[PDB]
Amino acid sequence: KDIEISASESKFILEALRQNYRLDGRSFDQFRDVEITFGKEFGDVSVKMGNTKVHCRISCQIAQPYEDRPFEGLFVISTEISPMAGSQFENGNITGEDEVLCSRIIEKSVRRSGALDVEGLCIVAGSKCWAVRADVHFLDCDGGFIDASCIAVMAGLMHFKKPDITVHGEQIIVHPVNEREPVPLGILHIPICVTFSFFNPQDTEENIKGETNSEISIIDATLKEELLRDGVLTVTLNKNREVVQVSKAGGLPMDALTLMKCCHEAYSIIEKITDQILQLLKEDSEKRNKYAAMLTSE
Amino acid sequence: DRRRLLGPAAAKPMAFEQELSLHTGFIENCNGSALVEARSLGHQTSLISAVYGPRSIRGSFTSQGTISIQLKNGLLEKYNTNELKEVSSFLMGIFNSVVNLSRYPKSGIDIFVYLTYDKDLTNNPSQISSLIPHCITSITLALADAGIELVDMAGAGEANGTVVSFIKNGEEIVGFWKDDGDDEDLLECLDRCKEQYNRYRDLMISCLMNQET
Amino acid sequence: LSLQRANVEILAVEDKPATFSVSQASSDLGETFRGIIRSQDVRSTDRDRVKVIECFKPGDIVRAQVLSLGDGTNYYLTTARNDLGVVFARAANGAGGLMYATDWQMMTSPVTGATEKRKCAKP
Amino acid sequence: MSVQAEIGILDHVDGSSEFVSQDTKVICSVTGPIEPKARQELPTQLALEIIVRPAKGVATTREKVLEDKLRAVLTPLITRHCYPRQLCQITCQILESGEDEAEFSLRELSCCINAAFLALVDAGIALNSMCASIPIAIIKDTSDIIVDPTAEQLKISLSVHTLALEFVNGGKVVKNVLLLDSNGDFNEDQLFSLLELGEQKCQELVTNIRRIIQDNISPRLV
Amino acid sequence: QIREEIPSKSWDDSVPIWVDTSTELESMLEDLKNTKEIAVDLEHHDYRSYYGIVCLMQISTRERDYLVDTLKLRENLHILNEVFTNPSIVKVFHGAFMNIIWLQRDLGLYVVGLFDTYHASKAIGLPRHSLAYLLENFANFKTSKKYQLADWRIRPLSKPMTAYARADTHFLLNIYDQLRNKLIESNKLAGVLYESRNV
Amino acid sequence: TFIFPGDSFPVDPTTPVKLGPGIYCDPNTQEIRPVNTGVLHVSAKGKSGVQTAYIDYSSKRYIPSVNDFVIGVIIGTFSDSYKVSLQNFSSSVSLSYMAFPNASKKNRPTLQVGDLVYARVCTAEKELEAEIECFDSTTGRDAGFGILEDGMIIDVNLNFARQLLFNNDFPLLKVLAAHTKFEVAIGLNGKIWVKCEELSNTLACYRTIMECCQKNDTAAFKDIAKRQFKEILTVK
Amino acid sequence: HMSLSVAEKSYLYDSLASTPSIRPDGRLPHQFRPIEIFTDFLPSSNGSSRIIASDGSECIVSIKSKVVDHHVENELLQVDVDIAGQRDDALVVETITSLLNKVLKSGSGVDSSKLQLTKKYSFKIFVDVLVISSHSHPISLISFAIYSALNSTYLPKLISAFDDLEVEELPTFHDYDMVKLDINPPLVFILAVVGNNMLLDPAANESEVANNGLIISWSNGKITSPIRSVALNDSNVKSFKPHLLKQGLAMVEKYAPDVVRSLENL
Amino acid sequence: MSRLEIYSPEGLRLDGRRWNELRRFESSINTHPHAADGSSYMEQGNNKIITLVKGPKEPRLKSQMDTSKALLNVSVNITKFSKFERSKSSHKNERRVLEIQTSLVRMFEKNVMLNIYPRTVIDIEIHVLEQDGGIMGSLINGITLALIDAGISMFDYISGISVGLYDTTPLLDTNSLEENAMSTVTLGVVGKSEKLSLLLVEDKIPLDRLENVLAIGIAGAHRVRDLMDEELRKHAQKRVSNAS
Amino acid sequence: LVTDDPIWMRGHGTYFLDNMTYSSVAGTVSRVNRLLSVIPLKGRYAPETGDHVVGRIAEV
RNA sequence: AUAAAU
């Protein structure tokens, strides 16, 4: 299945980008506002960017660690696409170019980066370990899937609580949420993912050698803008003033200076997003109990 | 596994006079079928062969037929999948001489052989080689029952791990399988398997006559 | 159904002196022999202009005679003569009741009173 | 029977909905009629691609059964002969179980049926009639028939039931019983008392459903 | 080398120059000697002749359009070989593969320095190779079919006819400028000159 | 008076009613019954003996019908016709080359893949590939159907498009004319083509129609155009 | 692999099936085509080889070792076969894999005594095969490479005592020092049956028209199992007289030492 | 049991190299003429890579055919004996490998016009015989060489490099030990330009470091590019001498 | 860089930017008239019009 | 008879 786009659309949107205009009425460095909604259960988070809707669910179960890593727990991230986000996606297509890329971006941003403290997922060394699972559900698509997913996974992990455990060797009674409160998963850092789309002016005249048409670069492109881009760039940054990961495969060849500018622009966005994410975690944490102060011991 | 139900992955499996019975045409799902049961001493083998074809292949320009054979483990998981493929390759090297391929252009014949059971008794203070002549017997029956033209009746025998398949009344050879055993058994195995062939042949011919009648 | 032709699939073949030979195959795979009836091979009357929509219908059974093998994809089928045409059919692509053949170019249903335009044969 | 639903929430799909009963929340999407894969093609009728996604983990054989039962309900509902050689993708993403998924799949199935129907309505696909599904359960001591049981009620149940009926004539005439999935063991008197009280609350639900449909859709029309 | 495109002379700016005497032809020759490029076309008739005869030749410079009576000047036209085989003067044809043959046959004329806009159009990958298409989109001119099926033989030639004879070359040099420039840009110019030499 | 599927019909069985979108005639039981949800519209002509009806319902998946104006995109070219898809993930439609003004077997049209065309559906069968034609006889001597150039195309639900094409009381075309000059093609397949002299105006029109498509408000739409054309100024 | 017309195949059969058999090339029924062999180019491995045929057929073998408990690890020599651009699962792959593992069994055609370290531990040998390119049955090609590789393999040397039953010392190996793997790798020859003639090293075109084929193993200066008849193609497979089978075994029995002699050069 | 460091105060690394040394580079063209249209054997350090370019040729399935451009496919075979410790399982389906394959495709899709071979297919088969750090950079160099050998048109060279970072200063061309010790950056450089085809960072990297690390890599990649030109030209001179 | 003369017509094996003409392949620089091209050392065989070729049917 | 069977 190949989507059909009119030649008229391809000429219109491209010309509009040369006039610094876009369909959804945004800027080039602007990122669509992200809305984060938490469900009743911990680990249930819904991320919304304009029309883009993604849902993440964090779950865990008692499991045994690998032989190679007796002190580390298990952690996996699932991002299987479905025709619900659009008929362009094949059901279970986990080997397609865009799918594998997205899967690899998230993995290198959360798993590989060590955003989650897997060492704190161990109950008894080389015997029993917690197995945290992050399931991302792509409900609908209006672009920015990678950005939506990173926010969804991280917000979920920071939301998530795991039943309190008392361990005495090989026997462990997992206290229920009724008996005692659940324990929040450890976090080392908060990675945020930014997606950049590159374009070509296709214009006859440039006013100056000194100042030139250069390259088109926008942030968080919509579905219509994502099909017309000539280049893809994803940079992951945090509030710790460091680059988590950056993935550029082919596309429109760009200077090292341009990448840095995108990287510096993304840093201002990930700062606002991280603080906002923490805020909505703070508002939901205080939200849960109508009578919590009456509840307290210490 | 999201395809089947494998259960808990943290668990572990359990750790601890020649006689023939031939029946064909008992499966209505395919074009030809066969049941072969053999009991010798403490060792017995029961396998089922299913034949589907000849069915037309769209766009096929082959001037002859195409045979595909696959062995399966019905119950006991003993034989390796790698070894099953090897026998399958051996079996196809046999029936490509037996089956009149010129009769089925642009067509293909799929052959499924289910090794539902084999029972082995070993005393304490190869293996699949013994099943091979029974697989050949089953397929040759299932093909003849299906209506597939065979140039000759294919049969074989197992002598000290040396399997050799015969046609044209033992005058020629359509397959040879030798594993381990002992040397200088060339002349002996050729004579012992030739007797097993002739024995398996007459019972195979009689089988068709019986059921066909 | 297409505009310039009509492709089908072969089910059974008439024998020679009625008796038939049923070809057993899976219809949900595509292993069944496929055939194509040209618009010029629909009827001898007015071979040039023939409306395929008013002749055949998806699901309708058609008795025809094969002019030639053609390619591996499509056989050549003609319903030019009188004893050839749509034999068994139902109203509304099979949603309605059974219909019977009266006129050569008209098929009626003596149950709901529905009449659909087909290419009918002669008993 | 205080359910809540929204229609047309997804942008890149022909039709969508979000059905919520108690905890159980299911979002559904429908695209069709569209071009089908060769292996999906049906010469005369419409081909249904039905997908069910669980709230936790990946789709297993459990959801494969949910897809199968949901197929038995949606198939006779759709006027399939209107779309020969064509495809209709139907995807259900269960967002919240509302029940112990390790033991039951009752409420998730009923919510998927109601959501799928609503998504088909939104998509504008030919339907022969209307449909509604409710989960029912029976208590261990009291043996009472509880319509729309909670998760806690299911734990202490002797039998669990999924009932989906086909309605015509302004939601007053039961055309047929599309699906009845009873797991457990039964007594005849309880069954018909269940069906009598069940029909009443179902009829009340349709009336409520009609109200919701008109209220949301009328501002769009002229 | 890419250069600014020189538009065609404005319509009605100049009358086509009719060439049917030896003298007019010689003047025309002196004129073509002064160009760096010229556009050429022919009209050919095959109904009342076994092999065919060349009935008209159209030649345009950047400034003027010429219409040559190749019937009256059949035995005179060979002197154009001075310009037609001068390699430093581009000769622009559209659809000239037959016309090359006929120049030879009838007039004894050859072309060294050919650029064929048909190969140019193909190399660039335009949707249609038709000559009128260029006139339709670049000259805002609507092409007319009917006269061609007739006999160009009859004279005096109709004023409406003159535009059609006039139309063919009046516009071609600009089209050459535009096609040339894009071919240079596209890394495909070398290919078109090769095809043109084969024609 | 909202109408739902399976709803009872007041009209008598002996007297026929002309088919309308939303209304379905069962091939088996011959009964006429509504299958869509919305407002029933019925037109009666003369003192007695004739009737017509349909249902205005919210649907966005187009189904080709005779005499419907549609805007399609020609993905590919066959031997004798163009393959044009009115909508995404929808069956292809057959457009004849000979379905153009001044057509000939010698000269094919110059339309290339990716071009927008304004077309009307001539023959549309449920079990057969649909067909469209560039020129429609019913409209007049000249169809006004020609491939669109440039501009911008807009996705819109079938109801919004039908109201924009047949309803003169729809203020959308008026409120857009009060802001800028523009030409518009309207397709019953839920496509709207808009083109101005400047891109900023076309973009402004796009954004208004989208919001109007979203908003569905008569009062909002007049204001909506106000804030949209205003926002482009500052953005400039 | 190779695609030939009906005319070409018949001509080939006439050329080769003739009583004075002639190779299309001109070879004799016992002459092999020239091959090139490289060894010891993978320092990361214990042993390695690379064989290049005349038709471009190329195979790479690697030898790696691992200390295992021979009381729980029955098979001490595991052969793994692979081909880039080819799925692992394929009938040809598993068959050759199964076949090769039988050729190099621990107690069949290999002196597994040289792999033993202590009472309780021994060296597990992993023979990884990579077939880059091949135009016929690569079984004999792989066999030559495995041979060359196993004859240039060097394993670590043990330091600790060799009695785990009593003292039970942890297996430690002296640094730097290594011991060459003294072993007798078997060879696998493949023959072609065209009419009544038997050809050693069948070419691609030759195999296409062959009536049948033979796979005969060779170890310790004598014929050994596995011995397998094999259909080189599937369109011209016919039964063969027993004397042909005895002819093939005899043919290998006299030409194999010549091959080994040209192959035994260090 | 042992322990080791990264960078000593003496400016020496674990293997003996200093902070700015490229490993031994050997390059080889036309290694498999009878197996592919283009072929290259790469030796960058202990890394050993066979690269085969098969095409442009007819697609095996008409379903997968583009009438506007050639289909470019890349399959990387990381052998089970590439490392010191033999891997039990195959690495072919591994998500890490699928990303690598995808990454490489994205890189060269913009580097070959791929508009002049319509209705054809270019298959690139790679076999990694030995691995010792910077395998991604070596993969890039192997494809670029093999593609050129096949006479397949491309706009420019694409050189791949590996970067190692300790404290203030990164280490050029990292091996497995260093890769284990510290985060690395893999750079795809087009020709002699400053434009990156591939920027790959999989581990944590201070934000201050990258600008300077990039500067070191680009300079080193230019040297690598110069060597490659020398490697092919030198071979041509050698081949001509052999002919003479 | 092969040349910096903008008068040249760039042929196969080359590409250009303003005055500069670069090589796209590894081979020898060829100058025929005004047509600058670079002949590759290796590559696929190319069909010229009028060649006598021998071929084996692939598909019907 | 001004460019025919993607």
All residues of chain D having their beta carbon less than 8 Å from the beta carbon of residue F8 are 169-170
Element (H, E) at F83: strand F81-85
In angstroms, the CA H7 to CA H170 distance is 10
SS3 G150: helix
Closest CA to H72 of H40, H108, H27, H18: H108
In angstroms, the CA D31 to CA D119 distance is 9
In angstroms, the CA A90 to CA A83 distance is 6
Do residues A223 and A205 touch, judged by C-beta distance below 8 A? no
Element (H, E) at G214: strand G212-219
Do residues G114 and G122 touch, judged by C-beta distance below 8 A? no
Parent domain of C67: 1-123
Residue with tokens 């070729």: I53
Here the CATH number for the domain that contains residue B33 is 3.30.230.70
In angstroms, the CA G230 to CA B93 distance is 6
Q: SS3 letters for chain A?
A: CCCCCCHHHHHHHHHHHHCCCCCCCCCCCCCCCEEEEECCCCCEEEEEECCEEEEEEEEEEEECCCCCCCCCCEEEEECCCCHHHCCCCCCCCCCCHHHHHHHHHHHHHHHCCCCECHHHHEEECCCEEEEEEEEEEEEECCCCHHHHHHHHHHHHHHHCEECCEEEECCEEEECCCCCCCCEECCECCCCEEEEEEEECCCCCCCCCCCCCCCCEEEECCCHHHHCCCCEEEEEEECCCCEEEEEEEEEEEEEEHHHHHHHHHHHHHHHHHHHHHHHHHHHHHHHHCCCCHHHHCCC
Cis-peptide, bond into residue A182, ω within 30° of zero: no
Domains of chain F in start order, with CATH, are 1-59 (2.40.50.100), 60-150 (2.40.50.140), 151-235 (3.30.1370.10)
Q: What sign for the dihedral angle of Cα G198, G203, G209, G214?
A: positive
F78 touches strand J (CB under 7 A): yes
**Hey, which residues does D147 pair with through a beta bridge?**
D136
Q: Which two tokens stand for residue H5?
A: 């460091």
All residues of chain G having their beta carbon less than 8 Å from the beta carbon of residue B190 are 242
Here the CATH number for the domain that contains residue E88 is 3.30.420.10
What's the CATH architecture for D1-222? 2-Layer Sandwich (3.30)
In angstroms, the CA F201 to CA F209 distance is 12
Using what technique was this structure determined?
Answer: X-ray
Do residues F20 and F54 touch, judged by C-beta distance below 8 A? yes
What's the CATH architecture for A5-298? 2-Layer Sandwich (3.30)
Nearest 10 degrees: Cα torsion F98, F100, F106, F112: -100
In angstroms, the CA A174 to CA B115 distance is 47
SS3 F13: coil
Closest CA to I48 of E115, E118, E101, E194: E194
Residue with tokens 């990292």: H174
Nearest 10 degrees: Cα torsion F57, F59, F64, F67: 40
Nucleotides of J under 7 A from a protein CB: 1-3, 5-6
Structural domain count of chain E: 1
Q: Which two tokens stand for residue H198?
A: 């591939």
Q: Which two tokens stand for residue C95?
A: 């949603």
Residue with tokens 């080709």: F64
Interface present between F and I (3 or more CB pairs within 8 Å): no
Across all strands, nucleotide nearest E122 (CA–C1'): J3
- Tell the CATH superfamily of the H1-242 domain: GHMP Kinase, N-terminal domain (3.30.230.70)
Closest CA to I37 of I6, I10, I59: I10
Measured CA to CA in angstroms, residue D121 lies from D31, D209, F22 at distances of: 12, 12, 12
CB burial of residue D182 (10 Å; 0-12, 13-18, 19+): middle
Q: Which two tokens stand for residue B45?
A: 């083998």
All residues of chain E having their beta carbon less than 8 Å from the beta carbon of residue I30 are none
SS3 B150: strand
**Hey, which residues does D163 pair with through a beta bridge?**
D134, D180
Could you tell me which residues come within 8 angstroms of residue F208 by beta carbon, excluding any fewer than 6 positions away? F172, F175, F176, F221, F224, F225, F228, F229
E143 touches strand J (CB under 7 A): no
CB atoms within 10 A of CB E150: 11
Which residues from F are below 8 Å from D when comparing CB atoms?
2, 4-8, 24, 27, 35-39, 56-61, 63, 89-92, 126-127, 158-159, 163, 167, 170, 216
Measured CA to CA in angstroms, residue C24 lies from A141, B30, C31 at distances of: 46, 10, 10
Parent domain of G215: 1-266
Do residues F157 and F213 touch, judged by C-beta distance below 8 A? yes
Largest CA distance in chain B: 60
Residue with tokens 């960058």: H44
Closest CA to G107 of G62, G74, G146: G74
User: Could you tell me how far CA A220 lies from the centroid of its own chain?
Assistant: 12
Task: Give the gyration radius of chain I's Cα atoms.
Answer: 16
CB burial of residue H222 (10 Å; 0-12, 13-18, 19+): middle
Element (H, E) at C35: strand C34-38
Measured CA to CA in angstroms, residue E103 lies from B13, E100, E110, I36 at distances of: 92, 5, 7, 31
Strands (E), B57-171: 66-73, 107-119, 155-159, 162-167
Largest CA distance in chain I: 50
Q: What angle (nearest 5°) sits at the alpha carbon of residue C71, between those of residues C68 and C72?
A: 115
When scoring F106, F107, F110 by the number of chain E Cβ atoms within 10 A, the one with the most, hence best to mutate, is: F110
Q: Does E187 touch chain I (CB under 8 A)?
A: yes
Could you tell me which residues come within 8 angstroms of residue B14 by beta carbon, excluding any fewer than 6 positions away? none
- Phi and psi at residue E38, in whole multiples of 5°? -140, 155
Q: Å between A199 CA and J3 C1'?
A: 39
Closest CA to B84 of B121, B118, B34: B118
Q: How do D130-139 and D157-168 pair as beta strands?
A: antiparallel
Q: How do B107-119 and B43-56 pair as beta strands?
A: antiparallel
Do residues A191 and A116 touch, judged by C-beta distance below 8 A? no
DSSP letters spanning E64-83: -EEEEETTTTTTTGGGGHHH
Look at phi and psi of residue G32 and say left if phi exceeds 0, alpha if psi is from -120 to 50, else beta. Answer: beta
**Hey, which residues does B102 pair with through a beta bridge?**
none
Do residues F84 and F147 touch, judged by C-beta distance below 8 A? no
Q: Does F138 touch chain E (CB under 8 A)?
A: no
A288 Cα to chain H: minimum distance (Å): 35
Q: Which two tokens stand for residue F145?
A: 């159907």
SS3 H226: helix
In chain B, residues preceding a discontinuity (C to N beyond 2.5 A) are: 16, 125
Q: What angle (nearest 5°) sits at the alpha carbon of residue D188, between those of residues D184 and D191?
A: 70
Do residues G155 and G175 touch, judged by C-beta distance below 8 A? no
Measured CA to CA in angstroms, residue H131 lies from A145, B174, D133, G44 at distances of: 34, 47, 60, 9
Residue with tokens 């109950």: A123
DSSP letters spanning F23-56: EEE-TTT--EEE-S-EEEEEEE-SSSS-EEEEEE
Element (H, E) at H25: strand H25-26
Do residues A144 and A220 touch, judged by C-beta distance below 8 A? yes
Largest CA distance in chain E: 47
Do residues H11 and I23 touch, judged by C-beta distance below 8 A? no
B146-178 burial, b for 16+ CB within 10 Å, e for fewer? bebeebbbbbbbbbebbbbbbbeebebbbbbbb
Q: Count Cα neighbours of E162 within 13 Å in the Cβ-side half-sphere.
A: 16
Strands (E), D46-197: 46-53, 86-96, 130-139, 145-147, 157-168, 173-183
Closest CA to H53 of H138, H137, H149, H176: H149
In angstroms, the CA E16 to CA E164 distance is 11
Across all strands, nucleotide nearest E133 (CA–C1'): J2
Do residues D128 and D78 touch, judged by C-beta distance below 8 A? yes
Q: How do G187-194 and G197-200 pair as beta strands?
A: antiparallel
Nearest residue to J3, CA vs C1'? Answer: E130
Q: What angle (nearest 5°) sits at the alpha carbon of residue I31, between those of residues I28 and I32?
A: 135
Element (H, E) at H76: strand H71-78
SS3 D61: helix
Residue with tokens 């075994």: G249
Q: Å between F78 CA and J6 C1'?
A: 7
Element (H, E) at H206: strand H205-206
Closest CA to B85 of G85, G96, G237: G96
Here the CATH number for the domain that contains residue G248 is 3.30.230.70
Do residues G29 and G191 touch, judged by C-beta distance below 8 A? no
Long-range contacts of the stretch H6-11 (C-beta < 8 A, 24+): H6/H166, H6/H178, H6/H181, H6/H182, H7/H166, H7/H167, H7/H169, H7/H171
Do residues H40 and H145 touch, judged by C-beta distance below 8 A? yes
Q: What sign for the dihedral angle of Cα D37, A5, H71, H197?
A: negative
Q: Do F127 and D35 touch (CB under 8 A)?
A: no
Look at phi and psi of residue A50 and say left if phi exceeds 0, alpha if psi is from -120 to 50, else beta. Answer: left
User: Which residue type does D182 have?
Assistant: S
Give me the count of residues in chain H: 244
Measured CA to CA in angstroms, residue E165 lies from D68, E60, H118 at distances of: 74, 11, 40
User: Which residue type does A54 have?
Assistant: V
Here the CATH number for the domain that contains residue I7 is 2.40.50.100
In angstroms, the CA G128 to CA H130 distance is 13
Could you tell me which residues come within 8 angstroms of residue D73 by beta carbon, excluding any fewer than 6 positions away? D113, D116, D131, D133, D164, D178, D179
In angstroms, the CA A267 to CA A193 distance is 10
Do residues H173 and H21 touch, judged by C-beta distance below 8 A? yes
In angstroms, the CA A105 to CA A193 distance is 9
In angstroms, the CA F118 to CA A45 distance is 45
In angstroms, the CA F198 to CA E144 distance is 34
CB burial of residue G64 (10 Å; 0-12, 13-18, 19+): buried
Domain ranges in chain A are 5-298
All residues of chain G having their beta carbon less than 8 Å from the beta carbon of residue H130 are 42-44
In angstroms, the CA D208 to CA D121 distance is 16
F167 Cα to chain D: minimum distance (Å): 10
Element (H, E) at E191: helix E189-198
In angstroms, the CA G201 to CA G192 distance is 8
SS3 E174: helix
